[PDB]
Design an enzyme around this catalytic site. Structure first.
Site, PDB file in Angstrom:
ATOM      1  N   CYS A 113      18.159   3.148  76.928  1.00  0.00           N
ATOM      2  CA  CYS A 113      17.570   3.703  78.037  1.00  0.00           C
ATOM      3  C   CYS A 113      16.567   4.819  77.966  1.00  0.00           C
ATOM      4  O   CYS A 113      15.713   5.330  78.719  1.00  0.00           O
ATOM      5  CB  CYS A 113      18.775   4.393  78.789  1.00  0.00           C
ATOM      6  N   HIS A 144      17.567  12.394  84.013  1.00  0.00           N
ATOM      7  CA  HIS A 144      18.051  11.066  83.551  1.00  0.00           C
ATOM      8  C   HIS A 144      19.001  10.609  84.522  1.00  0.00           C
ATOM      9  O   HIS A 144      19.333   9.356  84.964  1.00  0.00           O
ATOM     10  CB  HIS A 144      18.176  11.211  82.042  1.00  0.00           C
ATOM     11  N   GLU A 172      24.076  16.794  81.712  1.00  0.00           N
ATOM     12  CA  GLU A 172      22.608  17.028  81.752  1.00  0.00           C
ATOM     13  C   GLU A 172      22.365  18.260  82.584  1.00  0.00           C
ATOM     14  O   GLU A 172      21.765  19.180  82.447  1.00  0.00           O
ATOM     15  CB  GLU A 172      21.871  15.797  82.564  1.00  0.00           C
ATOM     16  N   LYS A 223      16.712   7.267  90.378  1.00  0.00           N
ATOM     17  CA  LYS A 223      17.588   6.407  89.988  1.00  0.00           C
ATOM     18  C   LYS A 223      18.246   5.495  91.084  1.00  0.00           C
ATOM     19  O   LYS A 223      18.812   4.379  91.479  1.00  0.00           O
ATOM     20  CB  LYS A 223      18.430   6.228  88.792  1.00  0.00           C
ATOM     21  N   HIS A 275      18.661   1.784  87.429  1.00  0.00           N
ATOM     22  CA  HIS A 275      18.264   2.099  85.913  1.00  0.00           C
ATOM     23  C   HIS A 275      17.666   1.085  85.493  1.00  0.00           C
ATOM     24  O   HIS A 275      18.177   0.044  85.385  1.00  0.00           O
ATOM     25  CB  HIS A 275      19.793   2.439  85.407  1.00  0.00           C
ATOM     26  N   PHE A 280      22.233   5.081  75.116  1.00  0.00           N
ATOM     27  CA  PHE A 280      23.565   4.556  74.223  1.00  0.00           C
ATOM     28  C   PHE A 280      22.950   4.774  72.735  1.00  0.00           C
ATOM     29  O   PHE A 280      21.756   4.213  72.402  1.00  0.00           O
ATOM     30  CB  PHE A 280      23.668   3.068  74.494  1.00  0.00           C
TER      31      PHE A 280
HETATM   32  N   LIG Z   1      13.907  10.976  83.903  1.00  0.00           N
END
Ligand SMILES: [N+]
Ligand SMILES: [N+]
Lengths: 420, 423
Positions: B173, B312, B323, B344, B349, B411
């Protein structure tokens, strides 16, 4: 608007860990290499009748010294959730950190140490078997570990977790160039100030019928059934590369950091060059020339200061000749003063690990002032008129080497590495 | 020794996304609060807990992706779907930039850094079957190219005559953010004067979705309108998308001399590893705090100078909270004076392309001084007490420099942050 000046730090190599067809363990592997040994053998298994290829270079497995025993590094429980290349990478990283004496414990040392380990290709068989299992046994039979097992960056992720390395975590995937990029990017991160130590390298295990079928069809794998002669870089009878497997990891460290802790220093990384052929997935080897030239520019050294090149030369009719040409065009009459060797006769082509294993071999050549041989080179064509360290190792200003890695997709890298 | 660190700006963007194709069209739809998340269709997806995804809309209309506009019919069979999308995105980026190297000097001065998070799994299994059935002679010579991560960067380089550094990352990611950050560093260092940088991924298939569902990563919500909702009480996993984003990064003086349109300046790049778990984020968010701090340090910017964060936050219980905790820890009282949003909910994603698409959104946020919303955020828990630009876009005017961060966490515990600023 034109920029600001910033501190650019010196970077050295203080540890090497090797899991290769020549064996496992730094100085054991170097000994075998210098002694003219090779890990290329005949393919065994009935599954290989479907392909024209009959040779490959495997990592020797077992409990003897210099063999690879997975159980030394990972538990039986870990082996189910990790691919073979990941396991090889953990072994190589452990040996590298041990070789370096770097085992970060404090929070500051852990955050100052990163990981940059690449992989050229994901494990095809794992995808293949999971697909069939999904189709015939259903969703609930797919392993929860399938994704974490097949991602390219998982070797770097697992090494980070295992050794608590909390700095930059980076994974390149550029086919044959993978291992060279990993070492170069690490060099740059350290010089820039992002980390004080980097655990850098490459890993691959691509020996399977499908993989070899794929490479046989797309490139040139040797069809030579004799494993003692199959791989012969620079030789008139060269007819394609030999697939190997393995992992190589190096510990790169900021210079003052290494001195302060009284590390044993193998060599200094001086420069890193990159280019693209932009041609085809070039007999004059222009991409190779530009990449070597870029590394020299980065290192601030003239061509005449280079004494050794570890060639990419994989034993292919076109590839070996193009690199030879690029070398001759760049170094001109100095091409006759230096030495060039390919160590792929000994290890085979390790794909994602190749650039890293060969950076390690160049590092040790600087350290020992000794050059590994090109195996099987009993004669050559007129165009191949350089010193290729044929058959036997040679003893050898500052010692400065280059190592070249040229990959599928036209991606090129060169590292400039020097004695200290 | 000290060395010149050159300045680096963004002069072109090309987007191929579930919101559509074309940078400014996508931006207008994003700001307008649109989403490309839809229900899955077909028996092929029966038995899998996830029933939603975000596709690139295909066709010949405005904002639709037509493969034939970028690659020939014969070239299709030699390359994967992600490669085709990257070629498309790159073409759009270079057109946006007005950069088309012709001379040898301009060619060698321009490189490519395009990553992929994961190769399409179906080519492997289909080729395996074909090989087991029809044998060696029917295995395609393009099978290896189709499964190599670096082939997008290679094809873009060939097609556009880009002879500079040729680089490809694969960090799940975080891929797209690394591609942009690495290109920034190459230009600043002097390896190239122009880089074509980004990420691509197109791996929505039964096997891929089964894989991510088994790792318990994906939303199980059948309602595509509600499935993805970053920071929301009912968040339950991410929604897989596909697409490509490419940005043209350029040395500042190079851009000025040719009178390029300049969107924004890349100020800094930070990287870290959680060193915790292979798929779960550090609940303390220590890794995220570290790569954000490293980005600020690289940029020479104080936390109090940041006005926007493109998070994210993929709409997972633990990820979003970790986060949020990192931002609150790093920025302290200033966390309440900045804005944070996750896009997102609009794009899904995009995996390998996520960090690049979101670098593009952050760049445009700087350029326009306008902030895209977090969709579906109609309420939140007490711990989510910041301004997440809920539901509707916000103008963000300042008389001081507009400076933004964009975060990407993957990941393997791999983290990256980019610091991008208005000029
Ligand atoms: N981002
Ligand atoms: N090499």
């Amino acid at each position: 608007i034109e920029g600001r000046s910033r501190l650019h730090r010196r970077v050295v190599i203080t540890g090497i860990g090797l899991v290769t067809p020549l064996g496992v363990g730094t100085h054991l592997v170097w000994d075998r290499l210098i002694g003219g040994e090779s890990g290329i053998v005949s393919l065994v298994g009935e599954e290989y009748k479907s392909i024209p290829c009959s040779v490959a270079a495997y990592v020797p497995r077992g409990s003897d010294e210099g063999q690879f025993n997975e159980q030394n590094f990972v538990s039986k429980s870990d082996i189910k959730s990790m691919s073979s290349p990941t396991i090889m990478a953990i072994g190589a990283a452990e040996l590298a950190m041990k070789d370096s004496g770097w085992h970060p414990q404090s929070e500051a040392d852990q955050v100052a140490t990163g990981v940059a380990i690449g992989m050229g290709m994901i494990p095809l068989e794992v995808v293949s078997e999971t697909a069939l299992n999904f189709q015939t046994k259903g969703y609930n039979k797919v392993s929860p570990f399938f994704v974490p097992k097949i991602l390219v960056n998982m070797a770097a992720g697992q090494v980070s977790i295992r050794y608590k390395l909390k700095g930059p975590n980076h994974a390149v995937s550029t086919a044959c160039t993978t291992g060279a990029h990993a070492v170069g990017d690490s060099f740059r991160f350290i010089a820039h100030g992002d980390a004080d130590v980097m655990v850098a390298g490459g890993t691959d295990s691509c020996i399977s019928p499908l993989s070899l079928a794929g490479f046989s069809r797309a490139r040139a794998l040797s069809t030579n059934s004799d494993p003692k002669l199959a791989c012969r870089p620079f030789h008139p009878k060269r007819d394609g590369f030999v697939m190997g497997e393995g992992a190589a990891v190096l510990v790169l460290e900021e210079y003052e950091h290494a001195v302060q802790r009284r590390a044993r220093i193998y060599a200094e990384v001086l420069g890193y060059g990159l280019s693209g052929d932009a041609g085809h997935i070039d007999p004059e080897g222009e991409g190779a020339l530009r990449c070597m030239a870029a590394a020299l520019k980065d290192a601030g050294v003239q061509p005449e200061e280079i004494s050794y090149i570890n060639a990419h030369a994989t034993s292919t009719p076109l590839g070996d000749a193009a690199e030879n040409k690029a070398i001759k065009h760049l170094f001109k009459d100095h091409a006759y003063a230096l030495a060039v060797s390919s160590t792929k006769g000994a290890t085979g082509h390790l794909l994602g690990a190749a650039g890293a294993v060969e950076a390690a071999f160049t590092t040790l050549a600087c350290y020992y002032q000794k050059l590994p041989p090109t195996l099987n080179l009993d004669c050559s064509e007129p165009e191949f008129d350089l010193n290729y360290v044929p058959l036997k190792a040679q003893e050898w200003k500052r010692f400065i080497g280059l190592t070249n890695s040229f990959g599928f997709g036209g991606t090129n890298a060169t590292l400039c590495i020097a004695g200290l």
